RNA sequence: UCUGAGAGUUUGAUCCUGGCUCAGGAUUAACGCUGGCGGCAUGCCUAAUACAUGCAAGUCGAUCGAAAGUAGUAAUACUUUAGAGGCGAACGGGUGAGUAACACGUAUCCAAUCUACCUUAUAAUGGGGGAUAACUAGUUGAAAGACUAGCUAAUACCGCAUAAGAACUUUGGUUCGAAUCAAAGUUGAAAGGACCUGCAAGGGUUCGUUAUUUGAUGAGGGUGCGCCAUAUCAGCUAGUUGGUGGGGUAACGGCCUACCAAGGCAAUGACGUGUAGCUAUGCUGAGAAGUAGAAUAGCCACAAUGGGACUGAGACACGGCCCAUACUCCUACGGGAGGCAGCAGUAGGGAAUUUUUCACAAUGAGCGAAAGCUUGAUGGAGCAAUGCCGCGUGAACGAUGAAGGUCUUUAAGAUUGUAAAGUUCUUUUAUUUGGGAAGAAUGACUUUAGCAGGUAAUGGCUAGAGUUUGACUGUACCAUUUUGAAUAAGUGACGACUAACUAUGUGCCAGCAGUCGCGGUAAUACAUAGGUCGCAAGCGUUAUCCGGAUUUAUUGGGCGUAAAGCAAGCGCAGGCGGAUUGAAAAGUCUGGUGUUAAAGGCAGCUGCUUAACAGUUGUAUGCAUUGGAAAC
């Protein structure tokens, strides 16, 4: 399946917030102990190499919203090119649509961004697109299909959304651009990328 | 069966009968030049040949194989 | 299927061995019987899987039980 | 005689024919002598660049071009520096 | 410039030797469970087992006569060819039984070859003869037919005339057996159809004929090197070895033949055994390379089995012929017919591998001046989760946290759990509507307009014009098109290796297990429940290949006590071997040339909404030959 039962629990256990920071921030009395009935004491007693690398190989791709073996292909084809590891890896992790949707802040969570994509509401650099996985470049230009902008979840986003330096957007227009690429300290660093790529010996 | 094979059933037979005419007077004129040796006799037996070099019952190569052979039993003077 | 013979250890709780039923095997070593070295196929043309099996129902051959 | 024909290279519901110097008895998609250019026979407004340099040679020492290799061999003037220089 | 991961297991405990197993990928996979869609690829590996059944290469009237039919009073004109004749049938499809060898890869020479359609160019395309299909009549059988006698025309056959040059020998001289010249002798060549013109005479155009001169092309022959195991295979071979004369063959040749001699191959593995289509390549590996020869492509072999030969230029012919063998089928007992390893399909085997599906729309092939015809090649559609890739099963908000479940042990709470209930949003897919491609920016077709070889005209070339040609297919796709969260999740493990833990039951019993090993009344290993995690339209198990395995150690292992130095000696062959000087130069090194098919691998790029995928360009490697060098 390409889709998740709960979020919440994700970041219970790996100990990252799937949010920016209200994954954890006391809604309902929000707790950081690990899931299921065993939560009361599994601190760290084995804690292992081969644990904490799948941990953040967890981490790595839940917060993207991958599965396994595409995550592979992308490895894969990010390994193909010649230049630095991790940073290019996480290059093409943001070069995803979806995620490049997220960016833009157009709407509240990536999941509802995604599925915008998939109906169709998203049209770039003046070709509607079905396919999230579609790899974005530097200076490619983006906008909102200019169609069924009607929508009580895509505004309070659009007016509200946070402007990152490395894509830029108009709002009242609702175009995008993908400038520059992300850099490392400018997303969340609670993801040690290393551990995740020396652990792919795959190829 | 297919049809169009029949048919050639037919055509090869009598050209078969021809070619086996015309071979077997090559042969006997070929024969002719063995018992008795002379430029005539010979001289038949090219223009016997050259009648089947135009076609393809006998190899052209053998046409001149052989008439090559009877030139050289010609050289025995 | 040829003319080879073989010992062979059934899985799961109870069996439908009919003395001279056909059935399906299945490669695998077991430790604790010396000789025997196969299994059989739970779940094939005549040997009926366990019932009451909901863990894994893969082996066994039990079907998806009705929620 | 050796042929000038279409060879179907690509995928499914997409021809994409290399243009062959090839013998008449020779199967389809077969081996072949010297390579003539290529041909995407989908998408238009030239997109049947070919090498020009062997194909004359070909015509210059036996050669059968087919109706659709006609067509390319009409527009690019194979014709008017191959029927006068034969004379 | 490329790149090298480990771990568990013998012990009371340790180090080492050492074997097993696991952590990674891959499949022509299959089985259990589950299963929504799209795109791409692939789909008997067992029985080269036997096959019900339907279709798989035919074409041509501008070759012939004649037949049938239509308009016509007739003359005549038109449509089809049963047959004769031209080409095609030898390609294209399928399979890998056989073959361990010039079969294949690869480099070569054929002073040993040939090659129709295709290509440069030349001479002529004259005139006669004699025949036969069909038809008729008869015999004869239900028919298949067969046979008997007459009739015909041709691009069917056969003589005759002259051969430009050939073909072969005769003679003379040329060059480093080849090739060319000169003269002589012998010898062989056609076919005409359609059309224009021409009162005619005759001239010409298109299609066709033979002999010629280059080739392209294809096939064949030979050699080098490489291309399995086996000595629990020591001799093997008598056309075998070599020569002579002849024949034969596209050509060489004991290939055969008449004569002579006994030779030849063999430890560097002959002969034999079993195995197997070879190669590119696929999977793995960093690599040396291990491994299977999938789809596909080059080469090879085969067509129920075994032989033979015609014809054809090309067959010893997959749906040609004869014969024999075995099997089957039909029948009117008189006789016949067949060879699904072509596309579908059936039977059997197997665990297992699909529609008795459409169209020449495109490529192509074949014929036909041309219309056009045949194509189960091909292109398409159906089926299959078999594999790779993409998309879905919603989304935002939503809690001291609904209910139930489990635990806690109950009367606290925690898990489930923003998960839920609920309020709102959208619709790829689900389901409507309308529009709707590209593939067919091809081509034939002939009017046009011109050019150009040659004329009186005719025909090609170049540009346009048009009607044109779609099984695919109203196809994909597009279009604020209708409605609607509605139309979609399972699977393996949870003691360690290796992320994931509690309860109930069972109590050496049922059972688990890749390894260690678990349970004889508190089991985190058995069965279930809850929960958790690993993958997910696939997940697991089994089977096979490589890796880890340096566990065959060339790179890259050891032989005192762990497996391993023969009981010792004499020693042929072989392997290795002091110093110095010269030469040659096999190895060795480097320079040039040729060659090493495409696809595939690598890299870039292009185009698919992007990977899956399709395409472009570049990219290694080895060998032969040639110029050098001269340490070893």
């Known amino acids: 399946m390409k889709y998740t039962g709960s979020i919440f629990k994700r970041s219970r256990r790996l100990g990252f917030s799937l949010l920016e920071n209200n994954k954890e921030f006391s809604k309902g009395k929000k707790r950081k102990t690990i899931p299921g009935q065993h939560g009361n004491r599994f601190r760290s007693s084995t804690m292992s190499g081969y644990a904490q690398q799948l941990q953040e190989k967890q981490r790595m791709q839940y ?27 996480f290059r093409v992790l943001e070069s995803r649509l979806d995620n490049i949707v997220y960016r833009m802040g157009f709407a509240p969570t990536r999941r509802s961004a995604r599925q915008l994509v998939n109906h169709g509401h998203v049209l770039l650099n003046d070709r509607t ?48 651009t993908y400038v520059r690429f992300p850099e490392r300290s400018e997303l969340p660093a609670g993801i040690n990328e290393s551990y995740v790529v020396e652990w792919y010996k795959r190829l | 069966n297919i049809k169009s094979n029949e048919k050639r059933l037919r055509q090869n037979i009598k050209r078969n009968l021809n070619n086996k005419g015309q071979k077997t007077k090559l042969k006997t004129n070929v024969k002719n030049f063995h018992k008795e040796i002379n430029l005539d006799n010979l001289g038949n037996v090219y223009s016997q040949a050259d009648r089947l070099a135009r076609k393809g019952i006998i190899s052209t190569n053998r046409a001149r194989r052989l008439k090559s052979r009877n030139v050289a039993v010609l050289n025995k003077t | 299927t040829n003319g080879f013979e073989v010992l062979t250890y059934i899985p799961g709780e109870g069996h439908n061995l009919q003395e001279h039923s056909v059935t399906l095997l299945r490669g695998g070593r077991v430790k604790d019987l010396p000789g025997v070295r196969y299994h059989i196929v739970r779940g094939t043309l005549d040997t009926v899987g366990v019932e009451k099996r909901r863990q894994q129902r893969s082996a066994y051959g039990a079907k998806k039980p009705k929620a | 005689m050796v042929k000038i024909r279409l060879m179907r290279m690509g995928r499914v519901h997409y021809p994409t024919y290399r243009i062959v110097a090839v013998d008449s008895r020779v199967k ?36 059968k071009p087919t109706d659709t290799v006609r067509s390319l061999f009409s527009q690019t003037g194979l014709w008017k520096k191959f029927v006068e220089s034969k004379k």
């Open chain 1, 63 to 89: 917060m993207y919203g991958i599965t396994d073996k595409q995550f592979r292909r992308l490895f894969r084809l990010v390994l193909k090119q010649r230049g630095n590891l991790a940073v290019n890896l």
């Open chain 1, 129 to 176: 697109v079905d396919t999230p996985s579609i790899i974005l470049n530097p200076g490619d230009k983006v906008r909102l299909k200019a169609k069924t902008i009607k929508i009580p979840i895509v505004k309070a986003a659009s007016e509200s959304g946070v402007v990152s330096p490395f894509v830029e957007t108009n709002n009242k227009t609702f175009e995008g």
């Open chain 4, 28 to 63: 389809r998609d077969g081996k072949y002598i010297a390579l003539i250019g290529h041909l995407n026979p989908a998408l238009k407004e030239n997109k049947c660049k070919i090498d020009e340099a062997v194909a004359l040679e070909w015509l210059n020492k036996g050669a």
